[PDB]
Design a protein around this nucleic acid. Structure first.
Ligand SMILES: [K+]
Ligand SMILES: [K+]
Ligand SMILES: [K+]
Ligand SMILES: [K+]
Ligand SMILES: [K+]
Ligand SMILES: [K+]
Ligand SMILES: [K+]
Ligand SMILES: [K+]
Ligand SMILES: [K+]
Ligand SMILES: [K+]
Ligand SMILES: [K+]
Ligand SMILES: [K+]
Ligand SMILES: [K+]
Ligand SMILES: [K+]
Ligand SMILES: [K+]
Ligand SMILES: [K+]
Ligand SMILES: [K+]
Ligand SMILES: [K+]
Ligand SMILES: [K+]
Ligand SMILES: [K+]
Ligand SMILES: [K+]
Ligand SMILES: [K+]
Ligand SMILES: [K+]
Ligand SMILES: [K+]
Ligand SMILES: [K+]
Ligand SMILES: [K+]
Ligand SMILES: [K+]
Ligand SMILES: [K+]
Ligand SMILES: [K+]
Ligand SMILES: [K+]
Ligand SMILES: [K+]
Ligand SMILES: [K+]
Ligand SMILES: [K+]
Ligand SMILES: [K+]
Ligand SMILES: [K+]
Ligand SMILES: [K+]
Ligand SMILES: [K+]
Ligand SMILES: [K+]
Ligand SMILES: [K+]
Ligand SMILES: [K+]
Ligand SMILES: [K+]
Ligand SMILES: [K+]
Ligand SMILES: [K+]
Ligand SMILES: [K+]
Ligand SMILES: [K+]
Ligand SMILES: [K+]
Ligand SMILES: [K+]
Ligand SMILES: [K+]
Ligand SMILES: [K+]
Ligand SMILES: [K+]
Ligand SMILES: [K+]
Ligand SMILES: [K+]
Ligand SMILES: [K+]
Ligand SMILES: [K+]
Ligand SMILES: [K+]
Ligand SMILES: [K+]
Ligand SMILES: [K+]
Ligand SMILES: [K+]
Ligand SMILES: [K+]
Ligand SMILES: [K+]
Ligand SMILES: [K+]
Ligand SMILES: [K+]
Ligand SMILES: [K+]
Ligand SMILES: [Mg+2]
Ligand SMILES: [Mg+2]
Ligand SMILES: [Mg+2]
Ligand SMILES: [Mg+2]
Ligand SMILES: [Mg+2]
Ligand SMILES: [Mg+2]
Ligand SMILES: [Mg+2]
Ligand SMILES: [Mg+2]
Ligand SMILES: [Mg+2]
Ligand SMILES: [Mg+2]
Ligand SMILES: [Mg+2]
Ligand SMILES: [Mg+2]
Ligand SMILES: [Mg+2]
Ligand SMILES: [Mg+2]
Ligand SMILES: [Mg+2]
Ligand SMILES: [Mg+2]
Ligand SMILES: [Mg+2]
Ligand SMILES: [Mg+2]
Ligand SMILES: [Mg+2]
Ligand SMILES: [Mg+2]
Ligand SMILES: [Mg+2]
Ligand SMILES: [Mg+2]
Ligand SMILES: [Mg+2]
Ligand SMILES: [Mg+2]
Ligand SMILES: [Mg+2]
Ligand SMILES: [Mg+2]
Ligand SMILES: [Mg+2]
Ligand SMILES: [Mg+2]
Ligand SMILES: [Mg+2]
Ligand SMILES: [Mg+2]
Ligand SMILES: [Mg+2]
Ligand SMILES: [Mg+2]
Ligand SMILES: [Mg+2]
Ligand SMILES: [Mg+2]
Ligand SMILES: [Mg+2]
Ligand SMILES: [Mg+2]
Lengths: 200, 153, 56
RNA sequence: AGCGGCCGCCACCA
RNA sequence: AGUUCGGCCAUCCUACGGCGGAAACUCCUUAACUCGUUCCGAAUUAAGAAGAGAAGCGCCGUCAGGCCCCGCCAGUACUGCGAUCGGAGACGUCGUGGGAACACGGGGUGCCGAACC
RNA sequence: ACCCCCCCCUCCGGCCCCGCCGCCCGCGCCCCAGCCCCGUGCCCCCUGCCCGAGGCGGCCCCCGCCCGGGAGGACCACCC
RNA sequence: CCUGCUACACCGGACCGCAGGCGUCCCACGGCGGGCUCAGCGAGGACCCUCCCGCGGAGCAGAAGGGCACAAGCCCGCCCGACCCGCGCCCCCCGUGCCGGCGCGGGCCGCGAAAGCGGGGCCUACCGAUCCUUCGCCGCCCCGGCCGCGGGCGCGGAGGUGGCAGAAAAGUUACCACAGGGAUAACUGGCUUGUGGCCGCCGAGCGCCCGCAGCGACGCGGCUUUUUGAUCCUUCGAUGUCGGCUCUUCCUACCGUCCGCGCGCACCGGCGCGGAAGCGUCGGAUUGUUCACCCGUUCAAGGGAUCGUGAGCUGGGUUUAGACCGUCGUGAGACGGUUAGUUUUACCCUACUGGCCCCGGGGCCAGAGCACGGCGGGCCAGUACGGAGGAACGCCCGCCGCG
RNA sequence: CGCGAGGGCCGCACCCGGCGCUGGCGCGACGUGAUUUCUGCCCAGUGCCAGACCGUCACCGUGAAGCGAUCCGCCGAAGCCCUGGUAAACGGCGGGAGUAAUGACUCUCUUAAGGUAGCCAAAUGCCUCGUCGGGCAAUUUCCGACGGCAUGAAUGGACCAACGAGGAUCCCACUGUCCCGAGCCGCGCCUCCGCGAGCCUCCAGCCUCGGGAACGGGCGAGGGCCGGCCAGCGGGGCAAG
RNA sequence: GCCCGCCGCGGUGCUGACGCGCAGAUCGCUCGUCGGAGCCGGGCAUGGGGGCGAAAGACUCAUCGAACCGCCUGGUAGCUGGUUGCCUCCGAAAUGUCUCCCAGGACAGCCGCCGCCCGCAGUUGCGGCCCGUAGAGCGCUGGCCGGCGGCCGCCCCCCAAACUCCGAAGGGCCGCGCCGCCCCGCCCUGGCCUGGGCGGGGCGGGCGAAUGCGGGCGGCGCGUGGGCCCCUCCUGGUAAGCAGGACGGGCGAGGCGGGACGAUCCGGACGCCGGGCCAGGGUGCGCCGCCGGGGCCGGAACGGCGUCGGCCGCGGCCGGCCCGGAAAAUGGAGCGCGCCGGAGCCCCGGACCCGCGCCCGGCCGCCGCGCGCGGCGGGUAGGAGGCCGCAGA
């Protein structure tokens, strides 16, 4: 029911989203983008890992769903369902067309019908991210390895200096918490206000 | 193209500038114009009478007629191997006085002024395209020592 | 059969071969299109100037 | 466009 | 300092607290006449001087929102010209020119012109 | 290793030996090692430029059919 | 004809490119002046009313984009610039026409205290030559004169050409044509590889247990040109266009036989992998068939060579002219089935197969050619192995195919 | 189906002709195609026909007006229109829902009428090598049944003894069709004496790969090769016509 | 209008012979019919859009879905073929608009020739105005994952050809010599003693970026209106040696060397010679030309305790060059032979080989010239000048 994925690998067309001009698009395969334990506080999971793209290409939503299930299932075995939070970074927003052979007209009136969706990714862009505690730190790179075999091309697995899905480094974050100057949201941490009406 | 009406392809050039909508200020009507003057054409998109075609936006011409309500402007226009002198009639909201010869009148006034002053020898009044620098000394008592840095990734 | 529809490939080179011409010097001063009420007063003024008048 | 009472019959150089 | 008429149209706007008034502007008092309100003297038109700094207006304030300037962001993103440079390609590199934005941190918060008191 | 190469087997330019019975041409020999390489890292360098035996290696030349039969056969050829 | 995008910041820029629109509608839905402020949130009020804030989030005939707040929107008053006479420019563009717009000189008007504004409906689309006909001014001519009818002419509108720079126009040919075209289809070949076919990588799972003996979802990466498409480069003064028969040679992506390893391999029999293209892969029933489907045997792989092979054949199919049926057509006729229908020429050149251009007897060998596979029986042995069943190295004896 | 002669059908430039030396048991125009057994429903459409003068529909003629040209009225043949008839004229001849695995049954929308008697995967059935049965070791063929892409009644339906250089399947007998080929005869071929042409021809005539108008005898690179001829042969010369 | 069968009359099958024939339809065997709607001979009748037809569009003297003969007629063709001596000077287009236009034309462009007349630029610099693309972003019109706190507020992952508050590179248009100061004359516009336009005088001045270089106007006319390729930038399509657009360049219409081989790639653009220098590519032998020095030893995902070199702490990540992944049909191609501490790959340095391409010298022709000499030379379609040869007056 699908062409082999080599038929839509590279970014050759201008982006073509579903809109009031494009209609009849089938539903993508991936619909959950935040798995694991997303409601855990910012202070719980200080470790973060990524899977950076090594190519400028297109990833299908069928492949995004395969890589989500591979990674998630592996960690939920070695470490339990609540030691990690896994986020899929890229979203499938681009529509690919097909000019369907069967009377048969060939290249006359060859503008094709919607057939699928793909995500448009660039060099060094993250595709998956994980934040976890220390009890899972050993097995995250094993689950990222699983996902890599579902994605076309060359991918790189790296460990970040940031604190979780926050924006400070661990040493930076530690000190800011050490003196007080750092705000807390739910699972994200910000800085002192220092602007606007004093209190009331 | 496949469709070529008078105001085709005008979605951005005829639109107003951000927070610059509404009526034109009244300097548009208190300026004095004279025969032979240079002007710029810029279309104001809120005034629809005597509004020139999009080709003429951003050109510079010369006044040939002073009418009761509109001005007559001459534009040199290239057509496929020759230049044509075109004449158009445009209302005041689309014309502004041009400074294309402003620099030349300042210099002509400045050369006759600096001649009157004579500095007993007359100074050189030709414009000079920037020359190579002359010889000079510079101190190196306090000198900084830089070098390439290591890759960080 | 089908043939080519359009190109401008060689046209800027043909446009340049004889130079880009310029309009006649006298087109810049043509009276065509000037106000008639200005062109009437222009004739009247000269006809009554002995230095300019050309009446016999 | 023409007679008759939407129907008939008949007309026809930008 | 004030009023009438203007230029440029927020460094002038919006919100909330204040402080002021000799003169000036305002609020304010009136329904005979003038003229007026899909009904209404609210508005507006006419006629006035008992009362006011409560408003509008002028001034001051605020880790105020906006707006305006500078620095950083950054010789980074991108790009003109040249290459028998690399790579299966997708893309990147070097030589020679041009060069951002967002974000971020500090500063600021109408002036010019005619006539009259 | 049913594969591949050689033998056996089919064709076969050329050549050699033997039967019958002359010409011409050239002048130069250790071997074996390269992480023993046994004392090296040379000689030759005039094919006429003044060279021109014997031995040792080369070269040339040398051999009918017709006719009739057949185990042979289009014609020829082949075997007698 | 028109809007936005394609289009890569002057202008310009292609496609049977993308999302759409137009052949109308309105004496007010028009002109002018004055007044007013919209959509709505919030908060109130017997079972629409009020205040407050309100950059337009409303409205402006109908596509889309742009424009507009004491207004270009709404309401009221008075009106007909939705006029007459004469010129010029802009867009498209050859700087020709047409649609559409804009700027002026002179008449006559509308509204307004006045300055002003007004040649429709805010701007970008909403439309039409010559000849003829018809109507409206103010005049001139009817040529030998004059008068009355009538006819013609100078100017301007209307009646229409949408295939919109504007002929007056139905089919069929299987009875056939002519000039040409590889500028252009039906068949080989070429580029491509979606589709077909073949091969990897990962490891959710299955497999009593046990992811990898054998398997392997979701996904991802390739190769091939034995399918079918896509395209139109070569061939239309012609490359004979299906299959079968006959005959030869080649590929390996290997079905049986050979040699090694592995097993969820006791034996027997199966299965998986590597090397290997020498030999073998057959006889028939129905079909033109390639394909398929059954019966039988020593149990039976897949392909290429101009979809190998028509001056080698055959001519069943398809594929002229006769004829029949069904559906369709007013008709001549058209298209799923059916039957009858001429297969021409080598003596040239090369290739190939043999043969020749007279030269003793016996030999040697450079080059070239090439050929022994497969299936059984007896003994081993009813033994090893394990109850039922049931092998092997070796030697010897036959058969089949080929030579 | 038309016509009783003063007619009908046809010829023909004109005058004049054929059927006709004829007369309804005749002449002319069409369809079906011996016999046997049959030939159902529809006149709304198209075609044809006869009976009525409603509307329309010519010139001529006639009235009113005009200087006259002319303008407007009235009059009104056939035809059409209207009223009927006609299918062995052309042609046409059904949907949905339930109801004892079927549906006698019922309600329903509908036509000018809704295919009757019969026949059938037919020389007419797409699906399709239909299903079942016969026959064979084995049958996309054949025969017999069953019931419709798109069977069917002088578009003639069904059946038929005799007849056919007509299209099919099977059996006995017969055989070189074949397994699988072998031997022989005459005449050509072949050699010789005599005689003696046609077609065709840029120039030439050995291969492999590359590139190239994408399949070369010639061009780039490699591998072969004295030269001259015969009997045969059909791979190539994109052989000839 | 019965059956077997001879002559006769016909023509079934062999898809036999022949098929450069015996023959522009024949021959062999086999076969239909043979008392009848049977076969044969002579005379006579019907004539071309007509005849005649047991009906095949058959036959009408080898001619028939309209005979033959002469003329109209050398019928018309936007279509195929051909179109005849030399040298010299110049030199294109395959595009816009309209067309019963789409294999054709007219008008414009491009080019030639003939002229005639008295500053300039396909460039940089300096100055003034214009644009909404790449990038960036989520305020606007839309789209989209989640987390905290009381429908609402703060954070947050990810987006747009028909979103844009910001905004390049890059382009585009205009200007760069005559100015000042007082007066005087003429006539629509103003309250006026106002303005504005066109002219006259008297005065002071004065050549105000770089670089190169002579410029402008007309007449008459032809060929062309199928293009294609490269580099960058794009659109449809799985893709294509596919189809459609853009600035600049090329082939067309460009010789020579090199890329083994090719219309277009790398160099270089051309009269006839002699000498020199050398671009691009290369330098074991074919085949003109090489040495020295430092290292190493077609194709995807994915694997490698092959070898050499790194970075971060036995381990983990990498780089160079190699190995596996890597299957086609006649015998065959890193050009061949061959090489492999090279005759291979990367880098450094000194040479060498040769395109009349550049330099110097001579000669030819053309265009110029202080008349001393100087610069130049390709060419399809097309145009112009000077001549060679033929027959006759
Ligand atoms: K991967
Ligand atoms: K233009
Ligand atoms: K106050
Ligand atoms: K062999
Ligand atoms: K042997
Ligand atoms: K033009
Ligand atoms: K228009
Ligand atoms: K006017
Ligand atoms: K007309
Ligand atoms: K008229
Ligand atoms: K022809
Ligand atoms: K053609
Ligand atoms: K062609
Ligand atoms: K072509
Ligand atoms: K391929
Ligand atoms: K073709
Ligand atoms: K083709
Ligand atoms: K052809
Ligand atoms: K040919
Ligand atoms: K095998
Ligand atoms: K026959
Ligand atoms: K045997
Ligand atoms: K045998
Ligand atoms: K045998
Ligand atoms: K009948
Ligand atoms: K009959
Ligand atoms: K009957
Ligand atoms: K009827
Ligand atoms: K009837
Ligand atoms: K009827
Ligand atoms: K029936
Ligand atoms: K049957
Ligand atoms: K029927
Ligand atoms: K009988
Ligand atoms: K018969
Ligand atoms: K018969
Ligand atoms: K028969
Ligand atoms: K024989
Ligand atoms: K090739
Ligand atoms: K070839
Ligand atoms: K050839
Ligand atoms: K060939
Ligand atoms: K007979
Ligand atoms: K024979
Ligand atoms: K015969
Ligand atoms: K008989
Ligand atoms: K006749
Ligand atoms: K005829
Ligand atoms: K004739
Ligand atoms: K003739
Ligand atoms: K004649
Ligand atoms: K013609
Ligand atoms: K023709
Ligand atoms: K010809
Ligand atoms: K036509
Ligand atoms: K054309
Ligand atoms: K044509
Ligand atoms: K022309
Ligand atoms: K947004
Ligand atoms: K496609
Ligand atoms: K050129
Ligand atoms: K390595
Ligand atoms: K080669
Ligand atoms: Mg695309
Ligand atoms: Mg020019
Ligand atoms: Mg308008
Ligand atoms: Mg037209
Ligand atoms: Mg026929
Ligand atoms: Mg072609
Ligand atoms: Mg494929
Ligand atoms: Mg073609
Ligand atoms: Mg042929
Ligand atoms: Mg052939
Ligand atoms: Mg074939
Ligand atoms: Mg052949
Ligand atoms: Mg043949
Ligand atoms: Mg036929
Ligand atoms: Mg041998
Ligand atoms: Mg019949
Ligand atoms: Mg009947
Ligand atoms: Mg029938
Ligand atoms: Mg035998
Ligand atoms: Mg040839
Ligand atoms: Mg050669
Ligand atoms: Mg041959
Ligand atoms: Mg008989
Ligand atoms: Mg008989
Ligand atoms: Mg025959
Ligand atoms: Mg003729
Ligand atoms: Mg002729
Ligand atoms: Mg030239
Ligand atoms: Mg063209
Ligand atoms: Mg026309
Ligand atoms: Mg026309
Ligand atoms: Mg092409
Ligand atoms: Mg050409
Ligand atoms: Mg060469
Ligand atoms: Mg050499
Ligand atoms: Mg020349």
């Amino acid at each position: 029911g699908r062409r082999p994925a080599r038929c839509y690998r590279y970014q050759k067309n201008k982006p073509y989203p579903k809109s009031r001009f494009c209609r009849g698009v089938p539903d993508p395969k991936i619909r959950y983008f935040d798995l694991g334990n997303r409601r855990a506080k910012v202070n719980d999971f200080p470790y973060c890992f990524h899977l950076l793209s090594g190519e400028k290409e297109q990833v299908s939503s069928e492949a995004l769903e395969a890589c989500r299930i591979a990674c998630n299932k592996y960690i939920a075995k070695k470490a339990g369902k609540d030691s990690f939070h896994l986020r899929i970074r890229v979203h499938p927003f681009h529509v690919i067309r097909i000019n369907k052979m069967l009377l048969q007209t060939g290249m006359r009136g060859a503008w094709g019908k919607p057939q699928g969706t793909v995500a448009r990714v660039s060099i060094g862009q993250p595709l998956l991210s994980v934040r976890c505690r220390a009890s899972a730190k050993d097995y995250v790179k094993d689950a990222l390895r699983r996902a890599k075999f579902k994605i076309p091309g060359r991918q790189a697995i790296v460990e970040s200096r940031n604190w979780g899905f926050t924006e400070f480094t661990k040493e930076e974050y530690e000190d800011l918490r050490e003196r007080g100057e750092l705000q807390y949201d739910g699972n994200n941490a910000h800085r002192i206000s220092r602007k606007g009406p004093l209190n009331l | 193209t496949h469709s070529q009406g008078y105001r085709c392809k005008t979605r951005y050039c005829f639109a107003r500038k951000f927070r610059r909508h509404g009526m034109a200020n009244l300097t548009t009507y208190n300026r004095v114009y004279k025969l032979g003057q240079y002007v710029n054409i810029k279309v104001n998109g809120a005034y629809h009478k005597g509004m020139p075609h999009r080709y003429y936006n951003g050109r510079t011409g010369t006044i040939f007629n002073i009418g009761p309500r509109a001005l007559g402007v001459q534009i040199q226009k290239r057509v496929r191997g020759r230049i044509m002198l075109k004449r158009i009639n445009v209302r005041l909201e689309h014309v502004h006085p041009s400074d294309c010869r402003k620099n030349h009148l300042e210099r002509v006034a400045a050369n006759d002024a600096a001649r009157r002053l004579a500095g007993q020898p007359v100074p050189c009044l030709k414009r000079q395209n920037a020359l190579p620098r002359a010889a000079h000394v510079v101190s190196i008592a306090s000198a900084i020592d830089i070098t390439p840095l290591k890759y960080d990734g | 059969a089908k043939l080519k529809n359009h190109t401008s490939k060689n046209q800027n080179r043909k446009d340049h071969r004889n130079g880009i011409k310029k309009p006649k010097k006298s087109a810049y001063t043509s009276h065509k299109g000037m106000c008639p009420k200005y062109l009437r007063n222009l004739r009247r003024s000269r006809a009554n100037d002995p230095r300019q008048s050309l009446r016999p």
